[PDB]
Write an enzyme that holds these catalytic residues in place. Structure first.
Site, short mmCIF file in Angstrom:
data_model
loop_
_atom_site.label_atom_id
_atom_site.label_comp_id
_atom_site.label_asym_id
_atom_site.label_seq_id
_atom_site.Cartn_x
_atom_site.Cartn_y
_atom_site.Cartn_z
N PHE A 157 6.64 -6.59 -17.60
CA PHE A 157 6.97 -6.92 -16.22
C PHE A 157 7.61 -5.72 -15.52
N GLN A 158 6.99 -5.30 -14.42
CA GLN A 158 7.45 -4.17 -13.60
C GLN A 158 7.56 -2.87 -14.39
N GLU A 192 12.18 2.24 -0.64
CA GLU A 192 12.63 3.38 -1.44
C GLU A 192 11.96 4.72 -1.10
N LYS A 214 16.57 -0.32 -19.50
CA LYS A 214 17.59 -1.31 -19.20
C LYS A 214 18.56 -1.55 -20.36
N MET A 248 -2.42 15.61 15.86
CA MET A 248 -2.94 16.75 15.11
C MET A 248 -4.41 16.55 14.72
C1 LIG Z 1 14.47 -6.07 -4.16
C2 LIG Z 1 13.86 -7.06 -5.16
C3 LIG Z 1 13.78 -8.44 -4.89
C4 LIG Z 1 14.26 -9.24 -3.67
C5 LIG Z 1 13.16 -9.54 -2.65
O1 LIG Z 1 13.79 -9.76 -1.38
P1 LIG Z 1 13.24 -10.78 -0.27
O2 LIG Z 1 14.22 -11.12 0.79
O3 LIG Z 1 11.94 -10.15 0.38
O4 LIG Z 1 12.71 -12.06 -1.07
P2 LIG Z 1 13.64 -13.22 -1.63
O5 LIG Z 1 13.94 -12.90 -3.19
O6 LIG Z 1 15.07 -13.18 -0.86
O7 LIG Z 1 12.97 -14.53 -1.47
S1 LIG Z 1 13.05 -9.26 -6.22
C6 LIG Z 1 12.82 -7.85 -7.19
C7 LIG Z 1 12.27 -7.82 -8.41
C8 LIG Z 1 11.79 -9.11 -9.09
O8 LIG Z 1 12.13 -6.46 -9.16
N1 LIG Z 1 13.36 -6.67 -6.36
C9 LIG Z 1 13.32 -5.25 -6.83
C10 LIG Z 1 12.15 -4.51 -6.13
C11 LIG Z 1 12.47 -3.38 -5.36
N2 LIG Z 1 11.52 -2.69 -4.72
C12 LIG Z 1 10.23 -3.06 -4.80
C13 LIG Z 1 9.15 -2.27 -4.06
N3 LIG Z 1 9.87 -4.14 -5.52
C14 LIG Z 1 10.79 -4.87 -6.19
N4 LIG Z 1 10.37 -5.92 -6.89
C1 LIG Z 2 -2.20 11.28 10.40
C2 LIG Z 2 -1.93 12.79 10.40
C3 LIG Z 2 -1.39 13.45 11.52
C4 LIG Z 2 -1.00 12.89 12.90
C5 LIG Z 2 0.49 12.59 13.05
O1 LIG Z 2 0.63 11.61 14.09
P1 LIG Z 2 1.88 11.54 15.10
O2 LIG Z 2 1.65 10.69 16.30
O3 LIG Z 2 3.13 10.98 14.29
O4 LIG Z 2 2.26 13.05 15.44
P2 LIG Z 2 1.50 13.94 16.51
O5 LIG Z 2 0.41 14.84 15.72
O6 LIG Z 2 0.66 12.98 17.51
O7 LIG Z 2 2.46 14.79 17.25
S1 LIG Z 2 -1.21 15.13 11.19
C6 LIG Z 2 -1.84 15.06 9.58
C7 LIG Z 2 -1.98 16.10 8.75
C8 LIG Z 2 -1.57 17.52 9.17
O8 LIG Z 2 -2.55 15.87 7.31
N1 LIG Z 2 -2.19 13.58 9.32
C9 LIG Z 2 -2.73 13.08 8.03
C10 LIG Z 2 -1.60 12.39 7.22
C11 LIG Z 2 -1.78 11.04 6.87
N2 LIG Z 2 -0.85 10.38 6.18
C12 LIG Z 2 0.30 10.99 5.81
C13 LIG Z 2 1.36 10.22 5.02
N3 LIG Z 2 0.52 12.28 6.12
C14 LIG Z 2 -0.40 12.99 6.81
N4 LIG Z 2 -0.12 14.26 7.08
C1 LIG Z 3 12.20 -5.90 -14.73
O1 LIG Z 3 12.21 -5.13 -15.96
C2 LIG Z 3 12.93 -5.83 -16.86
O2 LIG Z 3 14.14 -5.88 -16.66
C3 LIG Z 3 12.26 -6.53 -18.05
C4 LIG Z 3 10.87 -6.42 -18.21
C5 LIG Z 3 10.21 -7.03 -19.28
C6 LIG Z 3 10.93 -7.78 -20.21
C7 LIG Z 3 12.31 -7.91 -20.07
C8 LIG Z 3 12.97 -7.29 -19.00
S1 LIG Z 3 14.72 -7.55 -18.94
O3 LIG Z 3 15.01 -8.82 -19.67
O4 LIG Z 3 15.41 -6.47 -19.59
N1 LIG Z 3 15.35 -7.72 -17.41
C9 LIG Z 3 14.76 -8.53 -16.52
O5 LIG Z 3 13.75 -9.18 -16.74
N2 LIG Z 3 15.34 -8.55 -15.30
C10 LIG Z 3 14.94 -9.26 -14.23
N3 LIG Z 3 13.81 -10.10 -14.26
C11 LIG Z 3 13.40 -10.83 -13.14
C12 LIG Z 3 14.07 -10.81 -11.91
C13 LIG Z 3 15.31 -9.89 -11.92
C14 LIG Z 3 16.15 -9.76 -10.65
N4 LIG Z 3 15.69 -9.18 -13.06
C1 LIG Z 4 -5.44 19.69 4.43
O1 LIG Z 4 -6.24 20.15 3.30
C2 LIG Z 4 -7.10 21.07 3.77
O2 LIG Z 4 -8.00 20.65 4.48
C3 LIG Z 4 -6.93 22.56 3.44
C4 LIG Z 4 -5.87 22.96 2.61
C5 LIG Z 4 -5.68 24.31 2.28
C6 LIG Z 4 -6.55 25.29 2.77
C7 LIG Z 4 -7.61 24.92 3.60
C8 LIG Z 4 -7.79 23.56 3.93
S1 LIG Z 4 -9.17 23.24 5.00
O3 LIG Z 4 -9.45 24.49 5.77
O4 LIG Z 4 -10.33 22.90 4.22
N1 LIG Z 4 -8.93 22.04 6.12
C9 LIG Z 4 -7.79 22.00 6.84
O5 LIG Z 4 -6.89 22.82 6.74
N2 LIG Z 4 -7.69 20.95 7.69
C10 LIG Z 4 -6.66 20.69 8.50
N3 LIG Z 4 -5.52 21.50 8.57
C11 LIG Z 4 -4.45 21.21 9.43
C12 LIG Z 4 -4.43 20.10 10.29
C13 LIG Z 4 -5.70 19.24 10.19
C14 LIG Z 4 -5.83 17.99 11.07
N4 LIG Z 4 -6.74 19.56 9.33
#
Ligand SMILES: CC1=C(CCOP(=O)(O)OP(=O)(O)O)S/C(=C(\C)O)N1Cc1cnc(C)nc1N
Ligand SMILES: CC1=C(CCOP(=O)(O)OP(=O)(O)O)S/C(=C(\C)O)N1Cc1cnc(C)nc1N
Ligand SMILES: COC(=O)c1ccccc1S(=O)(=O)NC(=O)Nc1nccc(C)n1
Ligand SMILES: COC(=O)c1ccccc1S(=O)(=O)NC(=O)Nc1nccc(C)n1
Ligand SMILES: Cc1cc2c(cc1C)[n+](C(=O)C(C)C)c1c(=O)[nH]c(=O)nc-1n2C[C@H](O)[C@H](O)[C@H](O)COP(=O)([O-])OP(=O)(O)OC[C@H]1O[C@@H](n2cnc3c(N)ncnc32)[C@H](O)[C@@H]1O
Ligand SMILES: Cc1cc2c(cc1C)[n+](C(=O)C(C)C)c1c(=O)[nH]c(=O)nc-1n2C[C@H](O)[C@H](O)[C@H](O)COP(=O)([O-])OP(=O)(O)OC[C@H]1O[C@@H](n2cnc3c(N)ncnc32)[C@H](O)[C@@H]1O
Ligand SMILES: [Mg+2]
Ligand SMILES: [Mg+2]
Lengths: 582, 582
Positions: B120-121, B58, B170, B484
């Site tokens: 739950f969830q 998601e 729900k 970076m």
């Molecule tokens: C997609 C999904 C489920 C299917 C998981 O798919 P899988 O193929 O990985 O597992 P299986 O059930 O076929 O054995 S269960 C579920 C619940 C109980 O909320 N969800 C919704 C769900 C959606 N996204 C996340 C991060 N967590 C979740 N639990």
């Molecule tokens: C890992 C990283 C960076 C490297 C990205 O790696 P890439 O290989 O994808 O891109 P490039 O720089 O080599 O062209 S930049 C950065 C900043 C500006 O905070 N970070 C930290 C960072 C770490 N995690 C997330 C979700 N977002 C981020 N921006």
């Molecule tokens: C998952 O959030 C809920 O739906 C839930 C949480 C606590 C109590 C009851 C509920 S529910 O009865 O309204 N629905 C529910 O449990 N759904 C659900 N529960 C387990 C697996 C899947 C696919 N769906």
């Molecule tokens: C990223 O958060 C910060 O570090 C930052 C945010 C706003 C103003 C100043 C700063 S910082 O000067 O303290 N540091 C910074 O900018 N770091 C940074 N900025 C860009 C790319 C990478 C790898 N590092």
């Protein structure tokens, strides 16, 4: 403890923070670098005692730290940069809170003066995570680092364990200071309302109720994870049968004759029967969550309820007990055990008639699965893994049908073999959890029993497994669907598919995606397996091939997890029969 | 508008919610099913006008919705289940808020009576996202669905655009009701302080300052995304040169002679020179963020500052202007344009001397890159993509060096060709953003210019691309590092590597992971390219092969983004020379 700096030598806050971790006994962190945390990563390379395991996504990071914690009893540490780094931890924090998992999350933050200005990569992470952590901190002075780190670890690991987040501004990371390690923690409230050793008089009463009961049941959960010996002795001295929550699996050995296995929505008919008809419920380290109770008024409705919990907020939250003990279940068991030793012949405890009544339920309604032609039953695959690993493996899972089967069909012998997201139920958990588990347990068989929906969510962590040379085994139960959601579609929506198919509609009979190629991309040996006859050898190959391994197990998608009690239902509502076929 | 239900027919809240979307003109959603949102997905299959694009995570969902929004001007819609589903959106919401991107996020929630019970969830998502959304809602009655949906869309798209989250229990999804579509929105405060059409007297003053200036500069940003025509006319009538923020790219055509290109930390020497020495700064739809200003007191220190913004909270936040207009920049330009037409010969505007002074800076300090033997310069690859797509492609990027190069070396002709996470700077954005962009623009060339660190983070979305049969092209600039962060290690930490290498230390010369196999896993044609001579043909093949395509471009890792102004620095501090070699 030996420092790498002189006692009078100024050094960066980042270096103070790292030493603070070393002083807490930390050996492993899961840290992904970014701008706001560069200093911490620089300090980390200077440490000779802490290894960093670099994930490929910081959600991979937290989940690894959780796996680490859950499989070891030690807190899990993950580090992220500011902004998007910090936000990527969010699911893991929520997961840790709900499952009571000890965790310290450190996030870099923008410089203190930039805070609240909508600065580059700024997120008000403390505000965001307030409701999904046990506690959090914004460090506002380098002098506070030693205290905050000590408090964070103390809070994460004591009482009801949970995640604590520490937000550390970049300017504080760079500030030179001389740390003071002698500072007192500022937790007067928390420390004063820490649970005490249990009273003898409370424990005597429970032993008295046991002697007066004829149908007692142990209702055991995640709170018993450090009490397996104590619980073992307790059962050996009382002969009370043991039902377990999903979080409690392995506290009492699943392969023991006194075991009722898992209770709840997807629990065994006999475990639920036991609770339904009990006259004394011994709820130890459980939280009476909706998944196990169903309709509350109908849950254990004929029973005297004894509830022992370390969190007072839990005692009488959903069901009100007859008897409460607020404290450590380990100590309550220890106390009860020596009372039970002293009076063994005065008490003459014999629950054979009840224990027998449950045994006929265990024969008339055992865990069961159908086998169709040469097609692999997921349940059977897990059962083979159990046999071939001798029940000694550490198992992580994703969420869904496969997760329930991994719970039902593997016999956990110790707690902390079972690593699974229970409260939040977060997909994409199993693979990175296995990573953490493997680092915490370098000599253990570690298997991620995963589903194809869950596995793909954090598939990037396969890179981590290879580079870190971790022997993570992946038993991928591949049904091409979001199985759990698909099951509910079959039972409640007339099999109307609402985006639950994970394959390619254009080529609907080809297995999509090809998980073997994901493994190949990251240099991980992999095989597919389709016929049941081929299964025992496939899993043996997985186990024997040194290093990481992916085994893609193809399963018919129309299998259903059974039994099932519908949400908010009773024991009478239990479904024991059916699937999605025809 | 034609409903699928009778005007007097009760139906589920879920069905009301979906019709509410259809009535808002929604054609596409990005929804991943779970327990708490099953009903919404069931209702969605009943709609014949809305298509769901099922992501594989998601976070992939939100980022796709962002790509959709950013490339179209329409709001992006994503749907998630409760708990872990909801928490996975968090980075996307923060990203949308910071970049002012219109977005409606719907999350399923547990039944109303389960709220606050640690169900739950369950996640208190409204509490979690309060600081990272423009507004949010917990629906507490089925009667409120029509109103809340209308308010959510109105708030997300009006004023300063942003993300709005709607949490839907729900039981409310299942409740039968007759919707009322005539209800008044309850936004008296917001609606009363909506900006008005600009005053003539304010606009006359700006035109007056223009005539009195000798060194004017347009400082243009994301607020100008719908004003390209108006801005074009404004430049044509004034001859004022145009500097752009990262968010503003393409508002004024980059290949025009009057263009100064991007200003800021990684801006062009000439764009920054212009601002440094300007006597009149025309800041239109910008937020004076630290990335462009550096040290505030030294930014545009000799200039009369005119700031036009739709958000009053932004006017005078970081720099205080001499002149302000709170309103729509589109209308301010329209008003100024007809004043400039009426007085063209009375004003005799001629900035040739200034424009010329900047042109010598544009010759003495142009954007430049080194080429080493047969090795591919990332900059050059992007330049070839520009030539081969005729500058007409929609470009999404990840975050880092490659992102800066994509900004510097592609000539955007229209706004909404450039899709990039600017404020939060979230990695793993480019691929799912490309997905949304492709669905919103089914006839456009869509290229994700990505880095190997960023790409892998949401690599699972390759499954989505294939199944949805989207012609997403991936130009992967592969330097085996977090570039970076690596650059800052070279400049500020003596090249000390702190977990920035993304390959395998065991086999350090092999390209790891093999991205081609990720593409193969999801049935996406893919090639590697290593020699510069091979590049033009490789990219042509990518463009010509119908459908999705991954091109893995190997680059030397020691390249540096130039120029660079260090954080909190001045124009004097600019670095124009150097890299990580030897
Ligand atoms: C997609 C999904 C489920 C299917 C998981 O798919 P899988 O193929 O990985 O597992 P299986 O059930 O076929 O054995 S269960 C579920 C619940 C109980 O909320 N969800 C919704 C769900 C959606 N996204 C996340 C991060 N967590 C979740 N639990
Ligand atoms: C890992 C990283 C960076 C490297 C990205 O790696 P890439 O290989 O994808 O891109 P490039 O720089 O080599 O062209 S930049 C950065 C900043 C500006 O905070 N970070 C930290 C960072 C770490 N995690 C997330 C979700 N977002 C981020 N921006
Ligand atoms: C998952 O959030 C809920 O739906 C839930 C949480 C606590 C109590 C009851 C509920 S529910 O009865 O309204 N629905 C529910 O449990 N759904 C659900 N529960 C387990 C697996 C899947 C696919 N769906
Ligand atoms: C990223 O958060 C910060 O570090 C930052 C945010 C706003 C103003 C100043 C700063 S910082 O000067 O303290 N540091 C910074 O900018 N770091 C940074 N900025 C860009 C790319 C990478 C790898 N590092
Ligand atoms: C994802 C998913 C999960 C399912 C599920 C289906 C899916 C798809 N269905 C089931 C099901 O059928 N059956 C089932 O059981 N679960 C099921 N669950 C999980 C369920 O939501 C929940 O996680 C568990 O039921 C809760 O475990 P617990 O009751 O052990 O509390 P848990 O969450 O483990 O919390 C432990 C409790 O013990 C307390 N505690 C901690 N330490 C101590 C100590 N030392 N001494 C005293 N107390 C302590 C703590 O305060 C807390 O109250
Ligand atoms: C990830 C990353 C990002 C970098 C970066 C490096 C990295 C690694 N370095 C640079 C850099 O060197 N140079 C650079 O420019 N950026 C850079 N950025 C991005 C920077 O953090 C930030 O995103 C932009 O500078 C901000 O764009 P903006 O000033 O157009 O405001 P933006 O965030 O686009 O917000 C638009 C503004 O216009 C307002 N607005 C919206 N609609 C209207 C309307 N219709 N009429 C009047 N006003 C309206 C709105 O209130 C807001 O104040
Ligand atoms: Mg599956
Ligand atoms: Mg890279």
């Amino acid at each position: 403890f030996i420092s790498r700096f002189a006692p009078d030598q100024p050094r960066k806050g980042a270096d103070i923070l790292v030493e603070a971790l070393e002083r807490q006994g930390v050996e492993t962190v899961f840290a992904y670098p970014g701008g706001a945390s560069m200093e911490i990563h620089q300090a980390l390379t200077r440490s000779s005692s802490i290894r960093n395991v670099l994930p490929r996504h910081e959600q991979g990071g937290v989940f690894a730290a959780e796996g680490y914690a859950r499989s070891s009893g030690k807190p899990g540490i993950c580090i992220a940069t500011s902004g998007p780094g910090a936000t990527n931890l969010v699911s893991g924090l929520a997961d840790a809170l709900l499952d009571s998992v000890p965790l310290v999350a450190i996030t870099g933050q923008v410089p203190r003066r930039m805070i609240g200005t909508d600065a580059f990569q700024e997120t008000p992470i403390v505000e965001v995570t307030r409701s999904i952590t046990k506690h959090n901190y914004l460090v506002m002075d380098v002098e506070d680092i030693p205290r905050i780190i000590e408090e964070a670890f103390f809070l994460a690991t004591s009482g009801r364990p949970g995640p604590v987040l520490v937000d550390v501004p970049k300017d504080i990371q760079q500030q030179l200071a001389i740390p003071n390690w002698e500072q007192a923690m500022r937790l007067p409230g928390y420390m004063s309302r820490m649970p005490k050793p249990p009273e003898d008089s409370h424990l005597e009463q429970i032993v008295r109720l046991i002697s007066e009961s004829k149908k007692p049941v142990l209702y055991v959960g995640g709170g018993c994870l450090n009490s397996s010996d104590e619980l073992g002795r307790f059962v050996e001295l009382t002969g009370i049968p043991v039902a377990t929550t999903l979080m409690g699996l392995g506290s009492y050995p699943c392969d023991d004759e006194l075991s009722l296995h898992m209770l709840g929505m997807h629990g065994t008919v006999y475990a639920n029967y036991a609770v339904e008809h009990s006259d004394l419920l011994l709820a130890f380290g459980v939280r009476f969550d909706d998944r196990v109770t169903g309709k509350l008024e109908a849950f254990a409705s004929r029973a005297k309820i004894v509830h022992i919990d370390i969190d007072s907020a839990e005692i009488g939250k959903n069901k009100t007990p007859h008897v409460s003990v607020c404290g450590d279940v380990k100590l309550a068991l220890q106390g009860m055990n020596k009372v039970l030793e002293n009076r063994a012949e005065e008490l003459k405890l014999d629950f054979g008639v009840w224990r027998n009544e449950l045994n006929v339920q265990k024969q008339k309604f055992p865990l069961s699965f159908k086998t169709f032609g040469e097609a692999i039953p997921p349940q059977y695959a897990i059962k083979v893994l159990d046999e071939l690993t001798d029940g000694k493996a550490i198992i992580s899972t994703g969420v869904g049908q496969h997760q329930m089967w991994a719970a039902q069909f593997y016999n956990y012998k110790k707690p902390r073999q079972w690593l699974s997201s229970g409260g939040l139920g977060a997909m994409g958990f199993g693979l990175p959890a296995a990573i953490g588990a493997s680092v915490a347990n370098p000599d253990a068989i570690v298997v991620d029993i995963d589903g194809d929906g869950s596995f793909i969510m954090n598939v990037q962590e396969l890179a981590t497994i290879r580079v870190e040379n971790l022997p993570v085994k992946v038993l991928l139960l591949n049904n091409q669907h979001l199985g759990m959601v698909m099951q509910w579609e079959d039972r409640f929506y007339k099999a109307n598919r609402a985006h639950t198919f994970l394959g390619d509609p254009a080529q609907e009979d080809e297995i999509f995606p090809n998980m073997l190629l994901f493994a190949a991309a990251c240099g991980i040996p992999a095989a597919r397996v389709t016929k049941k006859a081929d299964l025992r050898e496939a899993i043996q190959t997985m186990l024997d091939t040194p290093g990481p391994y992916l085994l893609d197990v193809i399963c018919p998608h129309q299998e259903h997890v059974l039994p099932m009690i519908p949400s908010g239902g009773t024991f009478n509502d239990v479904i024991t029969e059916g699937d999605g076929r025809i």
